[PDB]
């Protein structure tokens, strides 16, 4: 078995290997990359996502989210307080202000220490989940707006034609902005490209060990666990690496820099934080190997998780027994 310790793997495809996205995902899996839950892909030196980022300031962040924490430094939840709209140029100035800017630090490890020590005492503002793309239409390789759609994958594998669409999302971050522990909707893959700015640190649990993280989470968030049998789908809970180590939960960590792709694999729990002003783009995708994970994915039916239009068909076709209860949660 390849990669039996479930380490995060880093890949350096050539320009020729960068042509066929599905084939390269399958290659990475042949080398065991999925066992980690997360892989890094460094594009060939010849590739670029677009010519420049000099003209992005007028993009609108219609509903910036202030991420307010409750709990203790290593075990906390966050809620998202809606703020007034602002442009990307306005947000970048805010991120660089004395109130929100990255502190002086020695290296990524020192900054990680400062994040875990101090995150809860601040409420950074995140521009998340903004439909759109920064890939130039002429970029033909690994263009996250031109991937094969998950509806077309389900149709190819299973023969059933379904409604729904699959488009990318932009994320504009600042110091301490935080993504809580989660897997993707329907335990899909994700791919994330860091277009510009400061790094993003990731933490990930191997898919084969995801139930260990769930059991810890039920212990650490006991009221939430009673409210919903899949409360990590709410995307609000954080657990530090120190706490994970204290409880014997297998995980790994890596820092993504501008110009790099990360791929999350089905049922790979992940969480992380931004180091300073940045912009990422991400989208979900599927492969044939996903289908079995989609059929087994947990679902939130308490009403909190509320998701896209396109998840309806995935539940309806892959999980017909759960469909009625899940849909009640959506309404
Ligand atoms: O970048 C972020 O805030 C969160 N991204 C992801 O969880 C992802 O790409 O799967
Ligand atoms: Mg603009
Ligand atoms: Ni994710
Ligand atoms: Zn729920």
From Swiss-Prot:
Chain positions recorded as 2-oxoglutarate binding sites: 126, 192, 200, 235
Cofactor(s) annotated in UniProt: Fe(2+)
Cofactor binding note: Binds 1 Fe(2+) ion per subunit.
Domain JmjC: 136-302
Localization: Nucleus
GO cellular component entries: blood microparticle; chromatin; nucleoplasm; nucleus; pericentric heterochromatin; site of double-strand break
Residue ranges of domain JmjN in the record: 8-50
A GO molecular-function annotation: metal ion binding
Post-translational note: Ubiquitinated via 'Lys-63'-linked ubiquitin chains. Deubiquitinated by USP14 with the help of TRIM14 leading to stabilization.
Catalytic activity: N(6),N(6),N(6)-trimethyl-L-lysyl(9)-[histone H3] + 2 2-oxoglutarate + 2 O2 = N(6)-methyl-L-lysyl(9)-[histone H3] + 2 formaldehyde + 2 succinate + 2 CO2
GO biological process: cellular response to ionizing radiation; chromatin remodeling; double-strand break repair via homologous recombination; inflammatory response; positive regulation of chromatin binding; positive regulation of double-strand break repair via nonhomologous end joining; regulation of gene expression; regulation of protein phosphorylation
Residues involved in Zn(2+) binding: 228, 234, 300, 302
Keyword set, alphabetical order: ADP-ribosylation, Chromatin regulator, Dioxygenase, Iron, Metal-binding, Nucleus, Oxidoreductase, Transcription, Transcription regulation, Ubl conjugation, Zinc
Enzyme Commission (EC) number: 1.14.11.66
Chain positions with PolyADP-ribosyl glutamic acid modification: 16-17
Top enzyme class: oxidoreductase
Similarity comment: Belongs to the JHDM3 histone demethylase family.
Full protein name: Lysine-specific demethylase 4D
Organism: Homo sapiens (Human)
Covered range of the whole protein: 11 to 341 of 523
